[PDB]
RNA sequence: UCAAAGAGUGCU
C-alpha cells in the first residue's frame, strides 16, 4: 500500500506549485525521494534508522518552503494545505515508527520532543496519550516516569497529575531507589515553593517526605532480601544474619542520601 | 465481545488487546482454525498491548503459585489497574475460570471470559510467543520456563540442599 | 457493422432509471488500471457493512 | 545545442536492499490501458463463475437434533451462538452454537411445543432463560446455566408455571420488559410475576396462530387468526388496533428491525407478502419463488434480506427490493423446513425441519468467515460490483442465476407456470369483449377486506 | 482509557497512598 | 437528473485522479528544440547527438553490422527488453540489447520476410518464405503453422492472444497462441499486402493492397469493415498511432497521406517527397519517421489537425508555417530495410543492408511505462506470474469490433400418421386465431381515425 | 557460470 501514502502526498505538492514557491521539476525530485522513502518503510528489513531519515528528510523540506515563503510569497503563512500538510506527515511518520519498533526507547524520545516543541500546533492531551502508551509499554523503565513526572509539573505545573506519576510508578518499581529520592525531591520541591509562596503572601499583605523516607526504606530492604536470596529462604542461621548485614549497610547509604539531600533545602527545618 | 486478553509469561506478564473478534458460530470450521496458526491472520486479531517483566527469579516464584492456587498478586493487580478501563463492563479474556472471582472481587467493574474462543486466541498468543512481542524485551521463554521449571517443583516437594 | 447481440445487455439494470445513465457509468473504467488508489476505495465500498463477532441490535430511538 | 533523453536511475527502480521492493511505477493516461470494457467483463465473468464454485452453504448440524420434528426455533436477541430449539415430542433445548452443543435438555411438556422464546426476566451473567408453551395448557419457565462469564463458583430446571384453561399456540416476549404475550384460543399478556394471564386481547371469539413483538416500536404486537386475518395491536392503548383478512392464512410475521413500521408475512398461498403497518390496504412487495405454503419468515439483522421456510423441502433468500429470491438451498435430508432463523451477525442461517435436525447454513455461499488480509478484503470487494455492474449480461446471467433445484420443485414450477399461463390467455380473452374488467393490482389480490377504511 | 496521569482506583490501592493521602487530610 | 450529475460527480472525482497519478509520473521524455534560430534541427548530425548523451546512452545504443544475410527487418518485444532481428537472406536472432547475453541463434539458411515476439520473451514468431513458425528461447521450434503460408507481416495481439499473418496470396489466417487454432480464415480478394499494422486502441487489423486501398479486418467478421485509398500508387507501409486516431498511408506515387480513423477523413496529404519513402513509422509521442532509400526524415508533431503541422521538406525562405524535419539523418550506401522504435526508450531502431543501427532521438518513446502492464525490469518470478494472469483475463476474439466503447451498450406406424395430423390441425388454428386478432386490431385503427345514392344507402 | 524448469524455508 505504498501508493496509498503517496496519493496522501499529491494535494499538498499541488498546492506547492499553485502557490509559486517549488517549480514542476524541482517537486518532481521531491516526490522521487518520499517514493524511494517509503518502499523502505513498507519493506522487509525496515529499521529505526529508516523512519529517522525520512523525519529529517521533511524536516528540512519544511525549513525549504517556510523559508521560500518569505523570500518569494513575502508572507509568514499562506494559508493553504502546505503550512500545516509536512507536520502532520512527520507525526503520521513517528507513529508507524513507534508502531514497528516500540522497543527502541530512543525514538520515543524524538516523538515527545518533537512533539512538545510544537506546543501550539499539538495540544497538551496528544502529549499525554503517547505517555499513556509508553509507560505502558514499559512500566519498569522508572526514567519514564519521572520524565512524564518531570513535564507535567514544569509545563503545567500540575503536582496532583505528577504525584500519581510517583504513586504509580512506585507501585511497579519500588525496589529502585532513585525513583525514591526523585519522589521524595518532588515533594520537597512542592512544600518549598508552597511555603515561599506562604512568604510572598505576607509580604504583600516536610513530615510528608520523611513518611515516605520512612516506607521507602521498608520495602526496599524486602526486595534486597528478595535478592540474594533468589528463589528459596537461606537455611544457614548465619548467612541469613549476613543477609541482613547487607541490607542494613545498603539501607543506611541508601539513607545517607537523603540525609544529603536535605542540606540543600534551607527553608525547611 | 471480548476486548482485552491476559497472559502469563515466565519473564512477566503481557495484556493484549483483541483488534477483531474472531467468528463465534464457525469458530469450528477448519478456515478460522487455520488463521489461529498463520501469524500474519493473528496478529490481525490481537495486539501486544502491554509487558511487565518480573524483577527477579524470587518473584516469578511467588506469582508462578499466586497463578497456581488462582490467586492475584500484587504485580497482576498493578498491570490489570493500568491497563483496563473502569467503564458496560470491560471483558478480559483469562485462561483459567479460577482467576475469574479473584480478578472481579479486586476489580468490580471488569467480566472475566474463559470460554473456548478465549481458549483459542490464548493458544495463538502461546503459539507465537515472542514474536507477538513485536521486538519488546521478553528474554528467552524457553530457558526461563526451564528456570522457573524445578524451581516451583522443587519448592512444592520442599526440595533441599540438606 | 451491425452490433453482436451476444454483447447487448437486455434490459437496464438496476439501480439506473433511464437507458442514458446506463451509458454514463458504463463508460466508467472501475478497475484500478484506470483509476487511482484512493478513487478505486470510494467506488469499491459496497453500501452493506457489517463487523464480524457483533449483534446488530435493533435501531435506537432516533 | 539544448538535449535532454530519457535516463533511468538503476538505484530508484532496483533497489540497492535485497529486502526492499522495487519500485513498481504508475501511469494511468488511458492510452497505456486499452479494452478497459472487455477487460471488466472478462474480470466479472470469471468472478461469476469464482462464485458458483466457492457456493459450500451448508456448514454443520446443531449434535443430533431433537427427538421429533423440530417446529420452534428461538434465537438469543443479546447473544450470538445461543439457540433455544423445540420438537413435538415435548423435549426443548438450549445449543452452544459455537460448540454445536447442548447446554441442558428439558422434558418440558407432555404434548407438542406450540411456542418457544428466550428472555432476560425481571424479577421482582450466570444463567439464560426461555419460556415454553404446549397444548397441554401449560407455559414454563425455565432457567440455564451458561458459561458465558466465570465471575461465579445452579438451579437449573424450571422456574415458574403458568396454567391456562385453554391450549397455546404461539409465545412471544416483549423485549424492553419482563411482560410476554401467548396466542392460543385467545391472545393474553402476562407478566412473569403474575401467574394469572394480567390482560386479555381479543379482536373476537377467532382463534389466534401466531404473534410476533416488534424490535424497535416494541409496545406494538402483531398477530395471525385461523380465519386467514391479520390482527395489529398497541400495548400503550391495551387494545386491538388494525385488522385486514387475506384470501389465505399466514403461518409467521416478522418486524422489519431497520423500519419499525414495515414487516413481513409467511402465507399459504406459495408466497410472502412485505407490508406497510400504516396503509395496509396494499403490499408493500410480494415474494412468489416457492411451490409450497411458507411456513416460517424472518428479517436479517441487517435488514437487507428475509428468508422463507416452505414445505416444499428449501430456504430461499431474497433482496428486500426484489420479488424473487436469489438464493435456494436444499438437500434430500431437509423433509418439511418449519423454522428459518438468523444468527445475529446476519452471516448463517438457521434451518429447523420436522426430520428432527437443526442446520446451519451461510448467508452467502461463497463467503468465508476468516479474516482477510487487504489484498483480499480489495479483490474479492473488487469482483462484487463488477458482477452488481455486469448482472444483466446473458451469459452472467446464465453462469450466476443457475442453481440445482430438486426435480420435486421444477416440474411445480413449469406446471405452475402452465397455470399462469392458460390463466393469463383467459382474462386476455375476456378484455377483447367484456366492458368493464377492472384491473387488479397483483399487490392488492391477496386482500379480501380491511375494517378500518381510509 | 485507563491512564496513568489520573488516579483511577477512586481508593488509596498503594500502601504508600494511604500515608500520604492521611496527611492531605490532615494538612488541609 | 440529480442521479446522474451523482454519477457525473465521481467522473470529474475519477477525472481529477487521473491528474493527480499524472502529477506523480516519475520521469519525463528527451526534447530538442534549439537555443538559436539560425541553428536548425534538421543539420544537426547523430555523432554530436551521440557525444552529447550519456556513457550509457551510448552503450545502450546499439551498432550490429552484418552482411552475411542483410538487409536486416530489426524487431523488438513489446516489453522491449528482448530485440528480434531477421536478415533479408533469412537468419533471425533473439537477444536482450540491454543484458548482453543472447536468448536464441538461428542461421536457418532460408528467406524470412518478417519476424515477431510472441506472448512473452519466451517464446516467439518467425516468419520463413511458404511457412510460419514458432521458436522457444533456447532456440527450439516448439511448432509449425502449416496453416499459415506466404505470410509477410505477422502481429500478436497480446491480450487476444491473436496472431494475424498478411501475405501476398489474398489470403489471411487469425491463429490464437493460447488455443492452439486459427480463429477464422477470411480472403481480401484485393491481392497482395504490401503492408498490414493493427490499431491497439481497437485492435482492428490494416492491410493496404495495390490498388491503394488500406482495409479493415476483424476476426468475427466474414469481410473488411472499412475500403479507404489513400492514393493512386499502391500503398508502400501504413503506420498507426497507439492512440489510434490518427494513421498515415505513403503512396508508391511519392505522396505521403495522413489519415484519421476515428472520423475516417485524410487529415494531411504531401508530394513534396523526391521519391517513394521505403517505410514508416510512428512514434508514441505522435512524432512521424520517414524512410526514403538511404535518408531518414522525423517530423515532430506531425500528428495535428493544422496544415502547417503537416510535414514539408526542406523549407520556404524560412517560413514559419513550413514543417521541416525534427531530425534528418542519411546512412550513406544503404537503404532502410525497416523502421523500429524501441519500446520504453528514448530511442528509434533502424533496419538497414549493412546490418542493425539504432539511432538515439529525443522524446522517441513514451518515459514513465505501466509496470502493471509492462515493465522492463520484470523479474522472471514475476514474469510467469503475469503471464497467468494474462491468461485468467485472456480476451475472446469474439471480442473484437470496430469501437470498445460501444460493447456493454444496451439494445409408432400409424399412430404417429394421426399425431402429425392433429398437430397440424393446432397449427392452422393458431395462425387462424392470431388473424382474427389481426383485423380487430386494424378494426380500431379504422374506427379511431347523389341523393339517391344516399335515398338507397339503407339498401 | 549463465540459462531456462522444479520442490521447501523465512516474512510483509
Request: charged letters at 25%; glycine letters at 6%.
Amino acid at each position: 500500500k505504498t501508493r496509498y501514502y503517496l496519493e496522501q502526498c499529491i494535494p499538498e505538492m499541488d498546492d506547492l506549485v499553485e502557490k509559486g514557491l517549488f517549480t514542476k521539476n524541482e517537486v518532481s525530485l521531491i516526490m522521487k525521494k518520499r517514493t524511494d522513502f517509503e518502499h523502505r518503510l513498507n519493506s522487509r528489513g525496515s529499521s529505526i534508522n529508516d523512519y529517522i531519515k525520512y523525519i529529517n528528510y521533511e524536516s528540512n523540506v519544511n525549513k525549504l518552503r517556510a523559508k521560500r515563503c518569505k523570500r518569494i510569497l513575502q508572507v509568514k503563512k499562506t494559508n493553504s494545505l502546505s503550512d500545516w500538510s509536512i507536520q502532520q506527515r512527520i507525526g503520521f511518520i513517528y507513529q508507524r515508527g513507534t508502531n514497528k519498533f516500540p522497543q527502541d526507547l530512543k525514538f520515543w524520545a524524538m516523538y515527545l520532543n518533537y512533539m512538545k516543541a510544537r506546543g501550539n500546533q499539538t495540544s497538551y492531551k496528544k502529549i499525554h496519550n503517547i505517555y499513556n502508551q509508553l509507560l505502558k509499554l514499559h512500566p519498569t523503565n522508572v526514567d519514564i516516569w519521572i520524565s512524564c513526572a518531570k513535564y507535567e509539573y514544569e509545563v503545567h505545573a500540575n503536582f496532583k497529575s505528577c504525584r500519581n506519576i510517583f504513586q504509580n510508578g512506585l507501585r511497579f518499581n519500588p525496589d529502585v531507589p532513585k525513583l525514591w529520592y526523585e519522589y521524595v525531591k518532588f515533594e520537597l520541591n512542592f512544600i518549598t515553593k508552597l511555603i515561599n509562596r506562604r512568604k510572598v503572601m505576607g509580604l504583600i499583605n516536610g513530615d510528608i517526605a520523611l513518611t515516605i523516607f520512612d516506607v521507602c526504606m521498608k520495602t526496599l530492604g524486602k526486595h534486597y532480601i528478595n535478592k540474594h536470596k533468589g528463589y528459596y529462604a537461606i537455611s544457614d542461621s548465619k548467612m541469613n544474619i549476613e543477609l541482613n548485614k547487607e541490607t542494613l549497610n545498603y539501607l543506611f547509604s541508601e539513607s545517607l542520601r537523603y540525609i544529603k539531600l536535605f542540606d540543600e533545602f534551607l527553608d525547611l527545618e | 465481545p471480548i476486548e482485552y486478553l491476559l497472559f502469563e509469561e515466565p519473564t512477566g506478564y503481557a495484556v493484549f488487546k483483541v483488534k477483531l473478534q474472531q467468528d463465534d458460530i464457525g469458530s469450528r470450521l477448519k478456515e478460522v482454525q487455520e488463521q489461529i496458526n498463520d501469524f500474519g491472520a493473528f496478529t490481525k486479531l490481537i495486539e501486544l498491548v502491554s509487558f511487565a517483566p518480573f524483577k527477579g527469579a524470587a518473584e516469578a516464584l511467588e506469582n508462578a503459585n499466586d497463578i497456581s492456587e488462582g490467586l492475584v498478586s500484587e504485580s497482576l493487580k498493578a498491570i490489570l489497574d493500568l491497563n483496563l478501563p473502569k467503564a458496560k463492563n470491560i471483558t478480559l479474556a483469562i485462561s483459567d475460570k479460577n482467576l475469574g472471582p479473584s480478578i472481579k472481587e479486586e476489580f468490580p467493574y471488569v467480566d472475566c471470559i474463559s470460554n473456548e474462543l478465549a481458549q483459542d486466541l490464548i493458544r495463538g498468543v502461546r503459539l507465537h510467543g515472542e514474536k507477538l512481542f513485536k521486538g519488546l524485551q521478553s528474554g528467552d521463554l524457553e530457558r526461563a520456563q526451564l528456570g522457573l521449571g524445578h524451581a516451583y517443583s522443587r519448592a512444592k516437594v520442599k526440595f533441599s540442599v540438606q | 457493422n451491425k452490433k453482436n447481440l451476444k454483447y447487448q445487455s437486455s434490459a437496464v439494470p438496476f439501480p439506473f432509471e433511464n437507458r442514458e445513465q446506463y451509458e454514463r457509468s458504463l463508460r466508467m473504467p472501475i478497475g484500478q488500471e484506470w483509476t487511482s488508489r484512493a478513487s478505486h476505495q470510494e467506488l469499491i465500498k459496497p453500501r452493506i457493512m457489517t463487523k464480524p463477532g457483533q449483534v446488530i441490535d435493533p435501531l435506537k430511538a432516533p | 545545442m539544448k538535449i535532454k533523453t530519457i535516463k533511468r536511475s538503476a538505484d530508484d527502480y532496483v533497489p540497492v536492499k535485497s529486502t526492499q521492493e522495487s519500485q513498481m511505477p504508475r501511469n494511468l493516461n488511458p492510452e497505456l490501458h486499452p479494452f478497459e470494457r472487455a477487460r471488466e467483463y472478462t474480470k466479472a465473468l470469471n468472478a461469476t463463475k469464482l462464485e458458483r464454485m466457492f457456493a459450500k452453504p451448508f456448514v454443520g448440524q446443531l449434535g443430533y437434533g431433537h427427538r421429533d420434528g423440530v417446529y420452534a426455533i428461538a434465537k438469543n436477541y443479546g447473544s450470538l451462538n445461543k439457540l433455544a430449539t423445540g420438537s413435538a415430542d415435548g423435549v426443548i433445548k438450549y445449543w452452544n452454537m459455537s460448540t454445536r452443543e447442548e447446554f441442558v435438555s428439558f422434558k418440558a411438556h407432555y404434548g407438542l411445543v406450540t411456542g418457544l422464546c428466550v428472555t432476560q426476566p425481571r424479577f421482582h451473567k450466570s444463567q439464560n432463560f426461555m419460556l415454553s408453551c404446549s397444548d397441554d395448557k401449560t407455559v414454563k419457565l425455565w432457567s440455564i446455566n451458561v458459561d458465558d462469564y466465570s465471575n461465579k463458583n445452579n438451579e437449573e430446571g424450571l422456574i415458574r408455571t403458568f396454567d391456562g384453561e385453554s391450549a397455546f399456540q404461539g409465545i412471544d416476549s416483549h423485549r424492553e420488559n419482563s411482560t410476554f404475550a401467548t396466542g392460543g384460543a385467545k391472545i393474553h399478556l402476562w407478566d412473569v410475576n403474575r401467574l394469572k394471564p394480567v390482560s386479555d386481547l381479543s379482536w373476537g371469539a377467532d382463534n389466534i396462530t401466531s404473534l410476533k413483538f416488534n424490535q424497535n416500536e416494541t409496545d406494538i404486537l402483531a398477530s395471525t387468526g385461523s380465519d386467514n386475518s391479520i390482527v395489529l395491536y398497541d400495548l400503550r392503548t391495551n387494545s386491538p388496533t388494525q385488522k385486514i383478512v387475506q384470501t389465505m392464512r399466514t403461518n409467521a410475521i416478522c418486524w422489519n428491525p431497520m423500519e419499525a413500521f414495515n414487516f413481513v408475512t409467511a402465507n399459504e398461498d406459495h408466497n410472502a407478502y412485505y407490508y406497510d403497518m400504516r396503509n395496509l390496504s396494499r403490499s408493500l412487495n410480494v415474494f412468489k419463488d416457492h411451490v409450497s405454503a411458507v411456513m416460517d419468515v424472518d428479517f436479517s439483522p441487517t435488514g437487507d434480506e428475509i428468508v422463507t421456510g416452505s414445505y416444499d423441502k428449501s430456504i430461499r433468500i431474497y433482496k428486500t427490493n426484489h420479488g424473487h429470491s436469489r438464493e435456494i438451498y436444499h438437500t434430500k435430508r431437509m423433509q418439511h423446513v418449519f423454522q428459518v432463523k438468523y444468527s445475529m451477525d446476519s452471516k448463517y442461517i438457521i434451518s429447523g425441519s420436522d426430520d428432527g435436525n437443526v442446520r446451519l447454513w451461510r448467508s452467502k455461499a461463497w463467503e468465508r468467515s476468516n479474516v482477510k488480509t487487504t489484498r483480499e478484503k480489495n479483490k474479492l470487494e473488487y469482483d462484487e460490483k463488477l458482477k452488481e455492474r455486469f448482472r444483466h449480461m446473458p451469459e452472467i446471467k446464465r453462469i450466476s442465476r443457475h442453481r440445482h433445484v430438486p426435480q420435486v420443485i421444477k416440474k411445480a414450477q413449469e406446471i405452475k407456470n402452465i397455470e399462469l399461463s392458460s390463466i393469463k390467455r383467459r382474462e386476455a380473452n375476456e378484455r377483447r369483449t367484456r366492458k368493464d374488467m377492472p384491473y387488479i393490482s397483483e399487490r392488492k389480490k391477496q386482500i379480501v377486506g380491511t375494517v378500518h377504511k381510509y | 482509557h485507563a491512564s496513568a496521569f489520573t488516579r483511577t482506583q477512586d481508593v488509596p490501592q498503594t500502601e504508600l497512598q494511604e500515608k500520604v493521602d492521611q496527611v492531605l487530610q490532615e494538612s488541609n | 437528473r440529480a442521479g446522474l450529475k451523482k454519477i457525473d460527480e465521481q467522473y470529474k472525482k475519477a477525472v481529477s485522479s487521473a491528474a493527480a497519478t499524472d502529477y506523480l509520473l516519475p520521469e519525463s521524455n528527451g526534447y530538442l528544440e534549439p537555443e538559436n534560430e539560425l541553428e536548425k534541427t534538421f543539420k544537426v548530425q547523430q555523432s554530436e547527438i551521440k557525444s552529447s548523451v550519456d556513457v550509457s546512452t551510448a552503450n545502450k545504443a546499439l551498432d550490429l553490422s552484418l552482411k552475411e544475410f542483410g538487409p536486416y527487418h530489426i524487431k523488438y518485444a513489446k516489453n522491449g527488453t528482448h530485440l528480434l532481428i531477421t536478415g533479408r537472406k533469412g537468419h533471425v536472432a533473439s537477444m536482450d540489447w540491454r543484458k548482453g547475453q543472447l536468448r536464441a541463434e538461428l542461421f536457418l539458411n532460408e528467406t524470412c520476410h518478417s519476424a515477431t515476439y510472441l506472448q512473452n520473451e519466451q517464446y516467439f514468431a518467425v516468419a520463413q518464405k511458404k511457412y510460419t513458425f514458432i521458436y522457444d528461447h533456447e532456440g527450439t521450434e516448439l511448432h509449425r503453422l502449416k496453416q499459415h503460408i506466404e505470410a509477410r507481416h505477422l502481429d500478436f495481439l497480446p491480450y487476444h492472444y491473436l496472431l494475424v499473418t498478411a501475405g501476398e496470396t489474398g489470403w489471411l489466417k487469425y491463429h490464437d497462441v493460447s488455443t492452439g487454432q486459427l480463429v477464422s480464415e477470411l480472403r481480401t480478394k484485393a491481392g497482395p499486402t504490401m503492408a498490414m499494422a493493427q490499431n491497439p486502441w481497437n485492435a482492428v487489423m490494416h492491410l493496404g493492397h495495390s490498388n491503394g486501398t488500406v482495409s479493415l479486418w476483424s476476426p468475427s467478421m466474414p469481410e473488411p469493415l472499412v475500403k479507404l485509398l489513400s492514393a493512386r500508387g499502391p500503398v508502400n507501409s501504413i503506420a498507426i498511432d497507439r492512440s489510434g486516431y490518427y494513421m498515415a498511408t505513403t503512396g508508391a506515387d511519392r505522396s505521403m497521406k495522413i489519415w484519421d480513423i476515428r472520423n475516417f477523413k485524410q487529415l494531411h496529404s504531401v508530394e513534396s517527397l523526391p521519391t517513394p519513402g521505403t517505410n514508416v513509422s510512428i512514434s508514441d509521442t505522435g512524432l512521424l519517421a520517414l524512410s526514403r532509400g538511404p535518408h531518414v526524415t522525423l517530423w515532430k508533431d506531425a500528428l495535428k489537425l493544422s496544415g502547417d503541422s503537416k510535414p514539408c521538406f526542406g523549407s520556404m525562405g524560412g517560413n514559419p508555417h513550413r514543417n521541416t524535419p525534427y531530425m534528418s539523418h542519411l546512412f550513406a550506401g544503404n537503404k532502410v530495410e525497416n523502421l523500429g522504435f524501441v519500446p520504453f526508450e528514448d530511442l528509434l531502431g533502424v533496419g538497414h543492408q549493412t546490418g542493425i543501427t539504432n539511432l538515439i532521438v529525443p522524446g522517441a518513446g513514451e518515459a514513465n511505462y505501466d509496470a502493471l502492464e509492462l515493465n522492463p525490469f520484470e523479474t522472471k518470478k514475476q514474469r510467469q506470474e503475469q503471464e497467468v494472469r494474462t491468461l485468467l483475463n485472456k480476451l475472446p476474439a469474439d471480442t473484437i469490433t470496430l469501437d470498445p466503447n460501444s460493447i456493454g451498450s444496451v439494445d409408432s406406424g400409424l399412430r404417429s400418421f394421426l399425431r402429425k395430423k392433429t398437430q397440424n390441425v393446432i397449427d392452422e388454428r393458431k395462425l387462424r386465431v392470431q388473424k382474427q386478432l389481426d383485423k380487430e386490431k386494424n378494426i380500431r385503427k379504422r374506427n379511431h381515425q347523389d341523393v339517391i345514392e344516399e335515398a338507397l344507402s339503407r339498401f
